[PDB]
Symmetry: C2
Subunit: 107 residues, 2 copies
């Protein structure tokens, strides 16, 4: 092996993806990008995803295993507070047991 060995630090990930979020099996939001938390009226970290987002595409329930069994799908999410739509990938991180939504507003 010559494995990849570099990644973005959590800080750079939050700058590069200011609308990302990550959530755990319990559906709790555990991290957000800088802009997304700034524009939310309520703190998002510690809250359940479905109090704050709806999944527009694909036509599935907001369920951790359902999402994790679809790594190649392009997700479309709606931020419930202002109806802004975010688009991007849902990537499962097994070691930590979280999914990152790496999303940005689509236009």
């Amino acid at each position: 092996m010559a494995p990849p060995h570099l990644t973005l630090s959590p800080e750079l990930l939050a700058k590069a993806f200011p609308f990302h979020f990550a959530f755990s099996r319990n559906r709790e939001i555990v991290q957000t990008g800088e802009v997304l938390e700034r524009i939310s009226p309520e703190p998002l970290v510690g809250k359940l995803i479905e109090q704050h987002f709806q999944i527009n595409r694909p036509k599935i329930l907001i369920d951790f295993d359902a999402i994790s069994k679809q790594p190649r799908a392009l997700f479309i999410l709606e931020f419930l507070h202002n109806g802004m739509q975010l688009k991007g990938q849902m990537m499962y991180q097994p070691e930590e047991e979280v999914i990152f939504f790496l999303g940005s507003p689509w236009i």
Copy 2:
């Protein structure tokens, strides 16, 4: 502060961005995404960036410091080999002292 504490592992990053690469101050490529190594006639890691890519936008030289100074600019890089074009962001990471190009066609 309530800083972010989680990030994608190196392996997850290569899957999420299969056309990415990172390079160091000496301009040698230190990692690439999966697909990028697959469509490249020769191994990229350990090679100098300017032997494989050119910058189409913005109009700057291919040096680490100039690139580091365009944090918000959209980069369009051309794979010298097939002429394929990669568009994305250049992000400088102070601790490992690398720049990740997170782009795709």
